[PDB]
Amino acid sequence: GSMMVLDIQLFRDETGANIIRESQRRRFADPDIVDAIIEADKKWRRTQFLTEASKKLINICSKAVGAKKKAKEACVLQLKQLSKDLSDQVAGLAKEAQQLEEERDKLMLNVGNILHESVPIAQDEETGNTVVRTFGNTTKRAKLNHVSIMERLGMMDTSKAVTSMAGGRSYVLKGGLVQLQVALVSYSLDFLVKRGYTPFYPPFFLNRDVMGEVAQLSQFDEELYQVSGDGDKKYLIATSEMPIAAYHRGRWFTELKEPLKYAGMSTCFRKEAGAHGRDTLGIFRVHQFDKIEQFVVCSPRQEESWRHLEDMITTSEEFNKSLGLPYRVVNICSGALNNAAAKKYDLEAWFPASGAFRELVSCSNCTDYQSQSVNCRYGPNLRQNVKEYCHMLNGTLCAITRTMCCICENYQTEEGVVIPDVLRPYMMGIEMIRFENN
Amino acid sequence: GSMMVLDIQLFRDETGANIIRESQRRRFADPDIVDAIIEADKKWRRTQFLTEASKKLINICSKAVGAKKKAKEADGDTSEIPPQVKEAYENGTLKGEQVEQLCVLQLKQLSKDLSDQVAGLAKEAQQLEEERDKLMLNVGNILHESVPIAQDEETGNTVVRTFGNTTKRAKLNHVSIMERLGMMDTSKAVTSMAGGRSYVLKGGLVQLQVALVSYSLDFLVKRGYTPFYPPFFLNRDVMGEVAQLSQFDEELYQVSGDGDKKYLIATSEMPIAAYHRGRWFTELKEPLKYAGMSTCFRKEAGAHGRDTLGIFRVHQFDKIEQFVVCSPRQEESWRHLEDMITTSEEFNKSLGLPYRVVNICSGALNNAAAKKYDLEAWFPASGAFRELVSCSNCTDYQSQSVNCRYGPNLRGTAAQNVKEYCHMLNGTLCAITRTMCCICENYQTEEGVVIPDVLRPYMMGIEMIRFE
Ligand SMILES: Nc1ncnc2c1ncn2[C@@H]1O[C@H](COP(=O)(O)OP(=O)(O)OP(=O)(O)O)[C@@H](O)[C@H]1O
Ligand SMILES: Nc1ncnc2c1ncn2[C@@H]1O[C@H](COP(=O)(O)OP(=O)(O)OP(=O)(O)O)[C@@H](O)[C@H]1O
Ligand code: NA
């Protein structure tokens, strides 16, 4: 059943419907769908209006019979029949209500979050993404790519010894690379703790019902493994953003003078159904990887979320600067944005052997898209004419395997890989991991 | 289906079969079963004897036809196979010299009939092989001579060694401490999201978790172990070489959606063992020592509502594991077992945790283990010793199942009277959530939990995590 889509409230006002139509056109999506959603919703509201009315009339029938029969009268027989009929009508109204919600929500799958005014308008990323900032020597060239380096270290196995055990794109890390992996986890966690984030270690399973509130329906198809055996069926998490968002379901923050900031720490599991033969090379694109994630829950007011988005990307930049990895920050074009995001920044690191900018980090302001889906409310209650929801953002701090790949290319020498200065105290003071002699 | 059970070769020797029957009796397990396993294997070897005879006869048929056609011999009167010929190949006594008396039409029919026999024999072979290993599910590794002989743990285990003050008492148990810290959520906010026994850790407890992972890994690196980060999925075929059928029912989650069905690992021992499948170490002058690092996933199907509370027994937890592959000769694996339990002891001493070491009795040993030591840490608020660590010598039980051979591997070697396999051992260094529970009880004060000295540099120098 459950699925994550845009708030219905914005559709029920002429000005809001026009905001959504405009955002649809700017995303290269269908604006005509907004009318279809308003109509389905108008029918749905009608069923709810009749249901609330008829329920009140069911008590009228009950109280009437209670007063009449206490008065010792032999119309009661009619009132009883009318109670059964209204209960029948309410039952019929509910089945119709259900069908209409299903139709509405399925139409809404095609409606994205309202674009920020700064999002570039383009359908294609190569031409369409706008470069915001660059850091370091982004034209640097180096000898060996990350796959060759990790193979020459003797510290990564992606051969049939592993894939015949664990399937395609599975890998073993050994020795110095595991030390580096752990160094990055711990350094990444500390980096965020120092910036006011609360560490958060989630369950790696979510139930279907809950996963449906924080995942787009296409993610079930392309990205989420199903887990079974123990009670209800579950899904492995693709990112700690899922359980962190789900953790706020049904919550209500009367105010958030300070944001909630979490440093999500987890293994991430991705089926990568789309990537038939994209990579297959190294640990750059794998089904299982550690990631440290920024997650922010904040007030929906005064565009505070937009300020946090800037802080979050700046945080990921400062992290990569600390590692000395060259990069560019790009503002993702409207055609490439997922539905939840109102704006997205990617930090794409320069891979000097490979000769390419490759995404290490994405940071998104999802405003009230997830929040309305998980029902994470904000402010005072209606009983204020609008229901307010918290804003939520999420952004990579460090995706560990891709960052390891970038470090290997950028810090290679003839003898091995130099460990970035900041990571050394997190791996026993090791200055370099060395190639197998030949 | 794929299955981890004892090696067959020792069953086919009278002295070997008796050693196995004796070990079974000493485990309070079934010896009578060995006769049933020998019989199932006898049936199996018969299908191989016939298969090899018939495969050779098929080649003789082809060569005979070739020679007859070359000489322009007439094809013959009939393709009908003499009943004695059918009887002979069904019994494995048909000789090539007799086959060569047949005409071309007969040789052709016989080649087809022998091919059908070879196909029927492959199916018989596998129903017999499944029936056999299933009977083998109940047969344990040969006990080391020092294993206490008893059925029940609570009385049969032998306390070997103790460390620290194991009678001190403390006020709050680990559940109450982690609650008062505000850093562990096991409420419906979490369980309605992720199911029973699910948890969220926050704040200082995540810092402590990471500190333990990194300190544990460093602890083993300093002792010559190679870090090993595995895939957390194993496919059915491979999982069955390193697990018994009962673990599929009680312990292993199934994962699907992409490729064939896989299982989540319950310990890094599984993928590390599997990684050695089909290997052949001609010599291991030094052992291979691995420091396994992984999340472990356990259904806990048996422990339905056994513990329930806190993070002591959960479905998902980090663990750092010792895994050793070594020579099967000169009782070397027994020396490694002693070093491994000592390493886990020194780790706990370094954390300042009191404990006892117990030698696990014969009746309570799992099948793969020839001997097992557990380290049970003292939980002063619970008032009990609770298992933190197990270390076992599985000698060649996993290695035979995964086919990890030892010894010279040279051309010209025929049917080897004794195939040798490596020995494998495994032992917990640190199960992270249980160690956190132990630390919380032992290091509690009025204001919170004091961080053990050795972990402080691994969590930004923090000396204490404070109650809300
Ligand atoms: N299959 C993978 N293997 C290793 N790292 C990955 C993989 N998928 C994503 N990452 C890392 O996680 C970061 C965040 O990825 P995200 O959750 O945004 O998924 P995505 O499909 O890349 O979506 P987006 O288009 O927003 O980046 C990426 O920038 C990358 O560093
Ligand atoms: N469900 C669990 N939750 C948290 N920690 C666990 C769990 N199961 C095992 N552990 C930890 O892992 C360690 C090793 O566990 P092991 O794999 O040996 O499983 P076991 O069946 O509980 O123990 P044994 O080996 O004695 O049968 C235990 O000593 C304990 O510290
Ligand atoms: Na340049």
- Is there a single domain that holds both residue B110 and residue B217? no
Burial (CB count <10 Å: 0-12, 13-18, 19+), residue B48: exposed
Distance (Å, whole) CA B404 – CA B419: 10
Residues B54, B305: Cα–Cα separation, whole Å: 57
Closest CA to A396 of A304, A320, A338: A320
Instruction: Considering only the beta carbons, identify the residue of A172, A193, A428 that sits closest to B229.
Output: A172
Identify the helix (H) or strand (E) that includes residue A391: strand A391-399
- Cβ neighbours around B414 below 10 Å, total: 5
What order of strands is seen across the sheet that includes strand B288-297? A156-157, A172-174, B226-229, B288-297, B316-326, B423-431, B384-393, B371-379, B355-359, B158-163
- Nearest C-alpha of chain B: how many angstroms from A10? 28
DSSP A94-142: HHHHHHHHHHHHHHHTT-PPPPPTTS---S-HHHH-EEEEEES-TT---
Asked if A273 has any chain B CB less than 8 Å from its own CB, the reply is: yes
In angstroms, what is the span from residue A312 Cα to ligand 2's centroid?
39
User: Are A376 and A354 in the same domain?
Assistant: yes
How near does any CA of chain B get to the CA of A224, in Å?
A: 8
Candidates A285, A359, A367; CA nearest to A325 is A359
C-alpha A5/C-alpha A7 separation (Å) is 7
**Is there an atom of ligand 1 within 6 Å of A359 CB?**
yes
CB pairs under 8 A between A and B: 175
Which resolution, in Å, applies to this structure? 2.0
Say if the Cβ atoms of B231 and A161 lie within 8 Å.
no
Element at A349 (helix H, strand E): strand A343-351
Show the tokens assigned to A161: 């010894």
Q: Is A3 exposed, middle or buried (0-12, 13-18, 19+ CB in 10 A)?
A: middle
Q: Indicate whether A201 and A232 sit together in one domain.
A: yes
Measured between CB atoms, does B192 come within 8 Å of chain A? yes
- Whether residue A123 sits in one domain with residue A79: no
Q: Are residues A73 and A212 in the same domain?
A: no
| DSSP H/E element including A213 | helix A208-214
Rounded alpha-carbon distances, angstroms, from residue B361 to A371, B22, B143, B331, B392 = 55, 16, 10, 21, 12
* Residues of chain A neighbouring B229 (CB-CB closer than 8 A): 172-174, 177-178, 181
Task: Tell me which method was used to determine the 3D structure.
Answer: X-ray
Q: Do B293 and A182 touch (CB under 8 A)?
A: yes
* Whether residues B86 and B229 fall in one domain: no
Angle at B281 between CA B276 and CA B282, to 5 degrees: 165
Burial class of A36 by CB neighbour count within 10 A (0 to 12, 13 to 18, 19+): middle
The closest of B166, B173, B461, B449 to B310, measured between CA atoms, is B173
Check whether residue B198 and residue B148 sit in a common domain: yes
Q: Alpha-carbon distance B355 to B352, whole Å?
A: 10
Residue type, A96: E
| Cα A223 to Cα A185: distance, rounded to the nearest angstrom | 23
Structural tokens at position A173: 């890390």
Return the ligand 1 atom nearest residue A285 CA. Answer: 3
Cα gap B44→B136, rounded to integer Å: 14
* Measured distance CA(A188)–CA(A182) in Å, rounded: 10
Longest dimension (CA), chain B: 104
Q: How many CB atoms lie within 10 A of CB B285?
A: 5
Give the other-Cβ count within 10 Å of B460's Cβ: 13
Q: How many CB atoms lie within 10 A of CB B88?
A: 17
Rg from Cα positions in chain A: 27
Distance between CA atoms of A156 and A144, rounded to whole angstroms?
15
For chain A, the straight-line distance linking the first and the last C-alpha, in angstroms and rounded, comes to 57
Looking up residue A240, the CATH number of its domain turns out to be 3.30.930.10
Q: Find the B26 Cα to ligand 2 centroid distance in Å.
A: 25
Q: Would you say B97 is a known binding-site residue?
A: no
Q: Which of B298, B387, B426 to mutate to test the pocket of ligand 2 (most atoms within 8 A of CB)?
A: B387
As given in the structure block, the two tokens for residue B170 are: 């403390």
**Chain B residues lying within 8 Å of A181, measured CB to CB:** 229
The secondary element (H helix, E strand) that includes residue A222 is helix A217-222
Are B98 and B60 a contacting pair, CB within 8 Å?
no
What are the phi and psi torsion angles at A360 (to 5°)? -105, -30
For residues A188 and A202, what is the distance between their CA atoms, to the nearest angstrom?
Answer: 17
The verdict on B187 and B98 lying in the same domain is no
Is A308 known as a binding-site position?
A: no
Q: Which of A251, A250, A273, A270 is nearest to A260 (CA)?
A: A251
Q: Across-strand partners of B264?
A: B233
- Chain B residues touching A165 at Cβ < 8 A: 231, 234-235, 238, 271, 274-275, 277
- Closest-CA residue, ligand 1 atom 9, reads A285
Q: How many domains are there within chain A?
A: 2
Q: CB neighbours (10 Å) of residue A291?
A: 23
CA separation for the pair B40, B131 (Å, rounded): 7
- Number of other CB atoms surrounding residue A126 within 10 Å: 7
Q: CB neighbours (10 Å) of residue A363?
A: 28
| Helix B33-70 / helix B83-91 crossing angle, nearest 10 deg | 130
Residue B245, token pair as written in the block = 């059928």
Query: How many residues make up chain A in this entry?
Result: 438
Mutate to test the interface with A, among B193, B314, B325 (most CBs of A within 10 A): B193
The CB of A320 under 6 Å from ligand 1? The reply is no
Tell me how far the alpha carbon of residue A139 lies from the centroid of ligand 3, in angstroms: 4
HSE, side-chain direction, 13 A CA sphere, residue A223: 13
Contact B193 A203 (CB under 8 A): yes
Same domain, B132 and B259: no
Q: Look at A225 and B256 and tell me if their CB atoms are within 8 Å.
A: yes
C-alpha distance from residue B140 to each of A172, A292, B144, B182 (Å)? 31, 44, 12, 45
Nearest Cα neighbor of B322 from B358, B375, B360, B377 is B375
**Do residues B245 and B1 lie in contact, with contact meaning Cβ atoms separated by under 8 Å?**
yes
- Phi, psi dihedrals of residue B323, rounded to the nearest 5°: -140, 130
Task: Find the length of chain B.
Answer: 468
A 146-185 near B (Cβ less than 8 A): 161-162, 164-168, 170-175, 177-179, 181-182, 185
> What is the rounded CA–CA span in Å between residue A208 and residue A1?
9
Residue nearest ligand 1's atom 15 by CA = A362
Residue type at position B246: S
Contact B52, B59 (CB under 8 A): no
Q: Rounded to whole angstroms, how far apart are CA atoms B37 and B21?
A: 12
Gaps after which residues in chain A, C–N over 2.5 Å?
Answer: 74, 383
For residue A422, give both structure tokens: 């900041």
Write down which residue in B94, B123, B140 finishes a domain.
B140
B154: exposed, middle or buried (Cβ count in 10 Å: 0-12, 13-18, 19+): exposed
Given a contact cutoff of 8 angstroms between Cβ atoms, the answer to whether A6 and A217 are in contact is no
Q: Nearest residue on chain A to B237, judged by CA atoms? A: A165
Best substitution site from A241, A347, A402 to test ligand 1's pocket, by max atoms within 8 Å of Cβ?
A402
Rounded to whole angstroms, the Cα distance separating B442 from B380 reads 7
Distance CA(A26)–CA(A337), nearest Å, equals 11
Task: Give the rounded distance of the alpha carbon of A39 from its chain centre.
Answer: 29
Which SS3 state, helix, strand or coil, does residue A85 take? Answer: helix
Residue to mutate among A2, A155, A158, A165, with most B CBs inside 10 A, is A165
Domain edge (last residue) among B140, B166, B198: B140
- The 3-state DSSP class for residue A417 equals strand
Strand partners, A393: A296, A365
Distance, CA of B385 to chain centre: 26
Beta bridge partners of A292: A265, A398
The DSSP code for A225 is P
Residue B174's CB is within 10 A of a number of other CB atoms, namely: 27
Q: Which ligand is nearest to the CA of A346?
A: 1
Helix axes A146-153, A175-193, angle to 10 degrees: 120
Pairing of strands A377-378, A260-269: unpaired
Contact at CB, B229 and A203, closer than 8 angstroms: no
CA neighbor of A412 nearest in space, from A182, A226, A148:
A148
Classify residue A426 as exposed, middle or buried by CB count within 10 Å of its CB (0-12, 13-18, 19+): buried
Q: What is the C-alpha to C-alpha distance for residues B280 and B419, in angstroms, rounded to an integer?
A: 11
User: What is the Cα–Cα distance from B275 to B234, expressed in whole angstroms?
Assistant: 11
Do B221 and B345 lie in a common domain?
yes
What per-residue string of b and e applies to A323-355 under the rule 16 or more CB within 10 Å gives b? bebbbbbbbbbbbbbbbbbbbbbbbbbbbbbbe
How far apart, in whole angstroms, are the C-alpha atoms of residue B107 and residue B75?
Answer: 10
Please say whether the beta carbons of B19 and B27 come within 8 A: no
B291: chain A residues, CB-CB within 8 Å = 178
Q: Buried (b) or exposed (e) across B287-312, using 16+ Cβ within 10 A?
A: bbbbbbbbbbbbbbbeeeeeeeebbb
- Cβ contact B365:B391 at 8 Å: no
Q: Are A336 and A129 in contact (CB under 8 A)?
A: yes
* Measured distance CA(A204)–CA(B297) in Å, rounded: 10
Q: Which residue has the tokens 């990055």?
A: A184
User: Annotation-wise, does B316 bind a ligand?
Assistant: yes
Please name every residue paired with B391 in a beta bridge, in sequence order, or none if there are none: B373, B427
Name the residue with the closest Cα to ligand 1, atom 12. Answer: A399
CATH number of the domain to which A104 belongs? 1.10.287.40
Cβ atoms of B389 and B135 within 8 Å: the answer is no
- Whether B321 has a binding-site annotation, put simply, is yes
Interface of A with B in 219-248 (CB under 8 A): 224-232, 234, 236, 243, 246-247
Residue position matching structure tokens 């002295």 = B15
- Domain membership of residue B363 as a residue range: 141-468
State the first-to-last Cα distance of chain B, in angstroms, to the nearest integer: 53
Measured CA to CA, the distance from residue B92 to residue B94 in angstroms comes to 6
Q: A201–B203: do the CB atoms touch at under 8 Å?
A: no
Q: Which of B102, B12, B19, B100 is nearest to B56 (CA)?
A: B100
What residues 16-35 of chain A have any CB closer than 8 A to a CB of chain B? none
Q: CB distance from A429 to chain B under 8 Å?
A: no
Helix (H/G/I), strand (E/B), else coil: A318: helix
Q: Domain end: A112, A133, A154, which one?
A: A112
The neighbour count for residue B274, using CB atoms within 10 Å, is 27
How many A from CA of A134 to the centre of ligand 2?
Answer: 49
Is B313 a pocket residue for ligand 2 (Cβ < 6 Å)? yes
Question: B210–A225: do the CB atoms touch at under 8 Å?
Answer: no
Report how far residue B406's alpha carbon sits from residue B386's, in angstroms, rounded to the nearest whole number: 37
SS3 assignment for chain B: CCCCCCCCHHHHCHHHHHHHHHHHHHCCCCCCHHHHHHHHHHHHHHHHHHHHHHHHHHHHHHHHHHHHHHCCCCCCCCCCCCHHHHHHHHHCCCCHHHHCCCCHHHHHHHHHHHHHHHHHHHHHHHHHHHHHHHHHCCCCCCCCCCCCCCCCHHHHCEEEEEECCCCCCCCCCHHHHHHHHCCEECCHHHHHHHCCCCCEEECHHHHHHHHHHHHHHHHHHCCCCEEEECCCEEEHHHHHHHCCHHHHHHCCCEEECCCCCEEECCCCHHHHHHHCCCCEECCCCCCEEEEEEEEEECCCCCCCCCCCCCCCCCCEEEEEEEEEEECCCCCHHHHHHHHHHHHHHHHHHHHCCCEEEEECCCCCCCCCCCEEEEEEEEECCCCEEEEEEEEEECCCHHHHHHCCEECCCCCCCCCCCCCEECEEEEEEEEEHHHHHHHHHHHHECCCEEECCHHHHHHHCCCCEEECC
Report d(CA B310, CA A394) in Å as an integer. 29
Ligand 2 pocket member B387 (CB < 6 A): yes
Cα dihedral sign, A131-A136-A137-A143: negative
Instruction: Establish whether B336 is an annotated binding residue.
Output: no
Closest Cα partner for A345 from A115, A111, A119?
Answer: A119
Same domain? B174 vs B232? yes
Contacts of A243 in chain B (CB under 8 A): 193-194, 200
Say which amino acid occupies A342. Answer: A
CB B380 within 8 A of CB B440: no
Q: Tell whether A102 and A176 lie within a shared domain.
A: no
Beta-strand relationship, B226-229 and B405-406: unpaired
Q: Is B252 an interface residue toward A (CB < 8 Å)? A: yes
Whole-angstrom distance, CA of residue A250 vs CA of residue A229: 28
Q: Which residue among A169, A312, A359, A401 is best mutated to probe the pocket of ligand 1, counting the most ligand atoms within 8 A of its Cβ?
A: A359
Token duo for residue A386: 């609008």
Chain B residues with CB-CB distance to A232 below 8 A: 195
Which residues, in sequence order, are bridge partners of residue B284?
none
State which ligand 2 atom lies nearest to the alpha carbon of B319. 12
